[PDB]
Design a protein that fits this description.
DNA damage; 5-stranded antiparallel β-sheet; 269 residues; binds 1-(5-chloro-2,4-dimethoxyphenyl)-3-(5-cyanopyrazin-2-yl)urea; Phosphorylase Kinase, domain 1; Serine/threonine-protein kinase Chk1; Transferase(Phosphotransferase), domain 1; nucleus; 7 helices; monomer
């Protein structure tokens, strides 16, 4: 057995939020870099469960558009997760405030986000918190869906399970999660992918939350795409946004038909 191979040094402190601390671990022998999430199962009614589900799902995921899972280590209260390293940073960190990015790049990113979500969904799992700070990028600039701390399975043994736990991020959360007691997991994830498309194409967020009480959300229902936040979006990708940001979750577009979308399949643009 090659000596010293199980010794990753925590070079940098990648993240530092509500979760715990994410360090950039580099192997002592190989130098393989990796991201290490240090989750803290404290007290007696918090992470002891918060992390088991995140770790249980990660042990299923296997798509090149999803952050690869290596392993984990339960040391007393400190739980270390071995996940993929994305030197690309956050997609979020590639959106020019109030501007966006070149329309071609959005399209690419949107394809890979669709890729992973199709995959995730395939294996009955919903992320529930799709947003630019969760869409990581690597060396070749490929999109990776990360952080499955709120992901849950919505299909098991071929039975869909409606949801009712309100979790995610206000601006990105779909409308039905704030107006309906129960809802289908998948359409909530497409809606968020849609909120990302607009962010990627306008460098700004449509509204604070998908509720009548919110100025812009209402004008979007008025179809006031004039000189308002969507005035920065081209009619092609705007036509698609009209289909995703549909309120009735049952009338929304579905990942399959998004692939059949014009802009989605228009070259370079
Ligand atoms: C400073 O830019 C960065 C910020 C990051 O977020 C913590 C990362 N993180 C990653 O490489 N990957 C990951 C993968 N999974 C999680 C979870 N849960 C967090 N970070 C990398 C860079 Cl390069």
């Amino acid at each position: 057995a090659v000596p010293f191979v199980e010794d990753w040094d925590l070079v940098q402190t990648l993240g530092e939020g509500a979760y715990g601390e994410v360090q950039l671990a580099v192997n002592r022998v190989t130098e393989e870099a990796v991201a290490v999430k240090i989750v803290d199962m404290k007290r007696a009614v918090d992470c002891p469960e918060n992390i088991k589900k995140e770790i249980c799902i990660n042990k299923m995921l296997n798509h090149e558009n999803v952050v690869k899972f290596y392993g984990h280590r339960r040391e007393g209260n400190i739980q270390y997760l071995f996940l993929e390293y994305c030197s690309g940073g956050e997609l979020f960190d590639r959106i020019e405030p109030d501007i966006g990015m070149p329309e071609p790049d959005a399209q690419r990113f949107f394809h890979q986000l669709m890729a992973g979500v199709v995959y995730l969904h395939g294996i009955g799992i919903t992320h529930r918190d799709i947003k630019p700070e969760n869409l990581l990028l690597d060396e070749r600039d490929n999109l990776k869906i990360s952080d499955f701390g709120l992901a849950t399975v919505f299909r098991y043994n071929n039975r869909e399970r409606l949801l009712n736990k309100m979790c995610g991020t206000l601006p990105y959360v779909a409308p039905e999660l704030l107006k309906r007691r129960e809802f289908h997991a998948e359409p909530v994830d497409v809606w968020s992918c849609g909120i990302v498309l607009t962010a990627m194409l306008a460098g700004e967020l449509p509204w604070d939350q998908p509720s009548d009480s919110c100025q812009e959300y209402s004008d979007w229902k008025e179809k006031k795409t004039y000189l308002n936040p969507w005035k920065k979006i081209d009619s092609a990708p705007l036509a698609l946004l009209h289909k995703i940001l549909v309120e009735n979750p049952s009338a929304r577009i579905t990942i399959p038909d998004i692939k059949k979308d014009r802009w989605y399949n228009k070259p370079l643009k």
